[PDB]
Design a protein around this ligand. Structure first.
Ligand SMILES: [K+]
Ligand SMILES: [K+]
Ligand SMILES: [K+]
Ligand SMILES: [Mg+2]
Ligand SMILES: [Mg+2]
Length: 136
RNA sequence: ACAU
DNA sequence: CGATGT
């Protein structure tokens, strides 16, 4: 502890897993929604959590912001660190769109630099991350 | 077991 | 109850 309030918080929302995936980023202090991705018809929770972090990195870099990013996803934080999303989701026609976005997110990571700290939101201590969809 |  | 991941 404690919370770094000067930060961006991201989270995925889904209908089914695998299922319809969306994500959003919010100002941790105020909850102001800063970006929201259009729903993707089929994806996994972890793909969406991964895309949300990468989008946050791109959003902050474009704005010359040094704020950290909070995510509640152990998996996606590691995938971003590794620059490699190790998803089990079948690559087929139904999943082509999500897999294109994930491939493109990995590609951006491998062609850009950033100093943004990517931090674990401590749900057990602090409650739900501020970007949560409130579906559970 | 942990995190979603 | 189920699924995605380390
Ligand atoms: K939720
Ligand atoms: K959670
Ligand atoms: K499990
Ligand atoms: Mg989450
Ligand atoms: Mg959530």
């Amino acid at each position: 502890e404690e919370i770094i309030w000067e930060s961006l918080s991201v989270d995925v929302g889904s209908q089914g897993n695998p299922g319809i995936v969306e994500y959003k980023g919010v100002d941790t202090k105020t909850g102001e929604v800063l970006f929201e991705r259009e729903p993707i018809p089929i994806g996994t929770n972890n793909m969406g959590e991964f895309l949300a972090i990468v989008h946050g990195l791109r959003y902050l870099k474009e704005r010359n912001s040094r704020k950290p990013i909070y995510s509640d996803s152990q998996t996606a934080i590691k995938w971003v660190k590794d620059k490699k999303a190790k998803s089990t989701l079948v690559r087929n026609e139904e999943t082509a769109l999500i897999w294109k976005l994930v491939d493109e997110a990995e590609e951006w990571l491998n062609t850009h630099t950033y100093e943004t700290p990517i931090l674990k939101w401590q749900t057990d201590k602090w409650g739900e991350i501020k970007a949560d969809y409130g579906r559970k």
